[PDB]
């Protein structure tokens, strides 16, 4: 699945529709980033720039100009075609093919932006710019505005009003279109298949990074070259480190391994976490903690629907957690008192859900304490977890256990659709999967 | 294989040995880099910082202070241990374990560098700083020097002499120690195994990125999580694009595929290029170009030894190339005249070799036109290639052919050792390898 040219047009028009008359929106591409000396990291386009173009090149600027409610045109600044540069650093789109390829009215060379931008802003009343987003963008924009401000004798005028378009554009990104939901759906499938692979390949003696290797390769087999975030493979006590990325230890028989990995498909993020036994068999202690986390997830999956909020569902999860922890002797006291004291905090110290989209931790207003009412089209994760420190003062069998189970869902008219349920999470199903794979 | 604590000590001492008395060398770690929004690229330590520590954390500064020819001490600035930050973004070394772990005399919190650095520089005559390397480092250093310059009433004095240590440190990196050569040797083995995999997995119908996937996974199986540079898989006309990284096309029966990929093992780079037929069988036209490139490589491999230079060996390669191109009718005229005219330039437009080490395009002075005399310990690549544009005015069968064959070598006392010969390059051997793999 993918995003059509029409969709890109719709998005631009939807932004223009909210812009004042006599204004221009400036959206800059992400700059290239050095990995070491003269080598660069694989390029990653700025999410917002990508959202409006699907164009994967740096040194590009999208200019949306609105004359009035029925008139608006676009200008794209991008790298000029250069026989030399291209024979070296890959083919470039250029000005000639840009208009048709990206559906823009006009295309100019990025090398001429300082000679052209002020001319496009001259006479307008408002300019939409994400100030502070990129240093190079601010230089270009500030330089253009200064020329207009100081050019009264040349009859130039600078728009006195500058508005940050991030709030409006991110509000748009918060609601996925059918096309986006289709792409995210494929991202979930690919990511799930990867997690299934990891579970089937896992064997005591293998290192954490080995599972990382299996996962990244599965992403690649389906057209998702890069992960949407650095893969986490924490076995044993490493499972208690929320963003453990070293993945440098030997996985040990008897430990659990927590894998949080997600592919990036057509710019969209998959985000799954599955915790399972390295030897394919949950111990009683591991099961007792796992069950609490799984119930939290399953209940949350049942509750999420339009009308509720992340804050409200989180309340149910906290109750489930405090109750289970008390039954196991990890927490002592009255459930309700413990809840009012957030006694679960030492074991579940992060949120239950976050928006998901072009960025794994997607943009969009959450509202105070993430109280915003959910509506159809919003995409989010559901990731309860329990992490018991190696030195926690609880029964020995629970110390050093880190478990998280995370699925990605899209809110629908009547509830939600689980995009990542194709990879098992019920203990009996996880063991069966691993046992079946081990017959080879 | 790996780098021992002793080696790190030796390197620091070797740098101190070249420093003036009453001076301090400041070596900064690489800053973290954003991939998108709140997600970062996997961390990559600055090569020079790594060379002296093998420490993989950002916000760290190594300070080597030399009192005189027999007295010198070290101070490391690094992130303080924080229960919160670590439960989230991985374990930190901290000040307590640093001295023993990294073999430094003293360790202070990076958060206090602006309150401590000027005190360490006060009274010294010289400070070694790679000015312009990192903006954050320059702020810290300039801030410290200003405090000393303006603090005469507090009896503070700033070293009036600032020296860039890059020339001296890179000259050191230019010559590998036995330990380094052992690590690079393993890097070559791992990289070679990956290229062998790609050749064995290749099938018409597969996409370029699929081979990228096989390669990266093989790197990972042997402990090399990341590539030393972005993998290049150019099939067909894509082979004519030197740094083609899109790897987005379907590999076609009848085309050649050029793969340039290298792992990063213990910070060191592998760098191999192998071009082969997608269908496992070289056509006559493909063979005629391949042979010229292979002869260039084999001859170069025979010539490289102490006493010669990259410039000199390149001369032999140019002769081989011009001769072969004339025999095929791609070039017309007298060999020697064509050579004097660099008539090969349109088909071989890059260098034959580059230093190799902690950076794929390693540091070190090449001398005018890369004329520097080679000595034992230098590590470099040998990568001749011929690229015939799709629209080149030559016999049709040669248009759109891109071939490069690259090996990594270390200059020895009597010649050189090929670190990447474990992956075949002779045509008959490439076809045999592929035919054997295709019986499955």
């Amino acid at each position: 699945s993918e995003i059509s040219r029409q969709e890109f047009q719709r998005r631009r028009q939807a932004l223009v529709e909210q812009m004042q008359p006599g204004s221009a929106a400036l959206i800059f591409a992400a700059p290239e980033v050095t990995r070491s000396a003269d080598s660069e990291y694989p390029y990653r386009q700025n999410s917002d720039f990508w959202y409006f173009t699907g164009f994967n090149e740096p040194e590009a600027v999208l200019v949306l100009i609105k004359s009035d409610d029925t008139h608006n045109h676009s200008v794209l600044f991008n790298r000029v075609r250069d026989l030399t540069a291209e024979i070296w650093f890959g083919r470039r789109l250029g000005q000639d093919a840009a208009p048709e390829k990206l559906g823009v009215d006009r295309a100019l060379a990025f090398s001429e932006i300082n000679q052209q931008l002020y001319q496009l802003l001259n006479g307008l009343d408002v300019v939409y710019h994400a100030q502070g987003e990129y240093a190079y963008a601010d230089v270009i924009v500030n330089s253009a505005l200064e020329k207009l401000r100081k050019g009264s004798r040349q009859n130039l005028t600078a728009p006195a009003t500058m508005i940050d378009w991030r709030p409006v554009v991110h509000e748009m990104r918060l609601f996925k279109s059918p096309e986006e939901i289709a792409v995210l759906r494929r991202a979930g499938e690919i990511t799930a298949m990867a997690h299934t692979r990891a579970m089937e390949k896992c064997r005591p003696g293998m290192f954490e990074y080995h599972l990382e290797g299996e996962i990244h390769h599965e992403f690649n087999r389906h057209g998702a070259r890069y992960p949407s975030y650095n893969t986490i493979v924490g076995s044993g006590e490493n499972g208690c480190i929320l963003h453990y990325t070293e993945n440098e230890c030997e996985m040990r028989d008897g430990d659990l391994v927590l894998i949080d990995a997600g592919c990036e498909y057509k710019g969209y993020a998959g985000d799954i976490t599955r915790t399972f036994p390295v030897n394919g068999k949950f111990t009683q202690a591991q099961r007792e903690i796992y069950d609490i986390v799984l119930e939290s997830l399953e209940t949350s999956l049942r509750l999420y629907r339009p009308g509720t909020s992340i804050l409200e569902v989180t309340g149910e999860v906290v109750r489930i957690m405090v109750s289970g922890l008390v039954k196991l002797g990890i927490l002592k006291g009255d459930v309700d008192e413990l809840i009012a004291q957030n006694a679960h905090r030492p074991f579940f110290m992060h949120g239950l859900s976050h928006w998901l989209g072009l960025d794994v931790h997607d943009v969009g207003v959450y509202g105070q304490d993430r109280s915003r009412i959910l509506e159809p089209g919003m995409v989010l994760t559901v990731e309860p977890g329990l992490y018991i420190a190696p030195d926690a003062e609880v029964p020995e069998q629970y110390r050093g256990i880190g478990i998280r189970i995370e699925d990605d869902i899209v809110i629908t008219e009547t509830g939600n659709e689980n995009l990542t349920a194709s990879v098992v999470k019920k203990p009996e199903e996880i063991e069966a999967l691993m046992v079946a794979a081990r017959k080879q | 294989s790996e780098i021992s604590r002793q080696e790190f000590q030796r390197r620091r001492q070797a740098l101190v040995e070249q420093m003036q008395p009453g001076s301090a060398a400041l070596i900064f770690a690489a800053p973290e880099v954003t991939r998108s929004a709140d997600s970062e690229y996997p961390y990559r330590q600055n090569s020079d910082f790594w060379y002296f520590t093998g420490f993989n954390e950002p916000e760290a500064v190594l300070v080597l202070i030399k009192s005189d020819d027999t007295h010198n001490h070290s101070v490391l600035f690094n992130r303080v241990r924080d229960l919160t930050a670590e439960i989230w973004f991985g374990r930190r070394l901290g000040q307590d374990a640093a001295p023993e772990k990294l073999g430094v005399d003293r360790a202070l919190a990076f958060s206090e560098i602006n309150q401590q650095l000027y005190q360490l520089l006060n009274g010294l005559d010289v400070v070694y700083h790679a000015q312009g390397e990192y903006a954050y480092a320059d702020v810290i250093v300039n801030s410290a020097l200003e405090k000393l310059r303006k603090g005469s009433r507090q009896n503070l004095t700033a070293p009036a002499t600032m020296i860039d240590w890059r020339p001296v440190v890179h000259e050191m990196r230019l010559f590998k120690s036995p330990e380094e050569i052992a690590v690079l040797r393993r890097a070559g083995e791992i990289t070679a195994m990956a290229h062998t995999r790609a050749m064995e997995k290749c099938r018409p119908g597969m996409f370029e990125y699929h081979l990228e996937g096989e390669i990266h996974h093989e790197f990972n199986r042997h402990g090399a999580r990341y590539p030393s540079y972005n993998t290049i898989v150019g099939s067909g006309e894509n082979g004519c694009i030197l740094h083609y990284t899109e790897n987005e096309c379907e590999m076609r029966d009848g085309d050649l595929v050029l793969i340039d990929a290298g792992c990063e093992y213990k910070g060191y780079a592998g760098d191999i290029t192998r071009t082969f037929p997608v269908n496992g069988k070289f056509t006559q036209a493909q063979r005629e170009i391949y042979d010229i490139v292979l002869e260039s490589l084999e001859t170069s491999l025979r010539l490289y030894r102490p006493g010669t230079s990259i410039l000199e060996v390149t001369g032999e390669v140019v002769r081989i190339m011009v001769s072969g191109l004339v025999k095929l009718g791609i070039l017309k005229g007298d060999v020697d005249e064509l050579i004097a005219q660099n008539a090969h330039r349109p088909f071989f437009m890059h260098g034959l070799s580059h230093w190799l080490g902690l950076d794929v395009h390693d540091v070190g002075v090449y001398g005018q036109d890369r004329s520097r005399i080679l000595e034992p310990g230098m590590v470099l690549t040998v990568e001749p290639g011929l690229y015939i544009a799709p629209d080149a005015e030559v016999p049709e069968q040669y248009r759109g052919i891109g071939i490069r064959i690259e090996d990594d070598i270390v200059i020895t006392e009597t010649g050189n050792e090929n670190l990447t010969a474990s992956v075949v390059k002779k045509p008959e051997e490439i076809e045999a390898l592929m035919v054997a793999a295709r019986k499955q």
């Binding site: 975030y229 986490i232 929320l242 963003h243 949080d260 985000d271 976490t273 992060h350 949120g351 976050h354 931790h361 990731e383 977890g385 998280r404 995370e406 | 709140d38 989230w88 973004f89």
Partner: peptide, 4 residues
């Protein structure tokens, strides 16, 4: 994962 966990919101950073």
């Amino acid at each position: 994962x966990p919101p950073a």
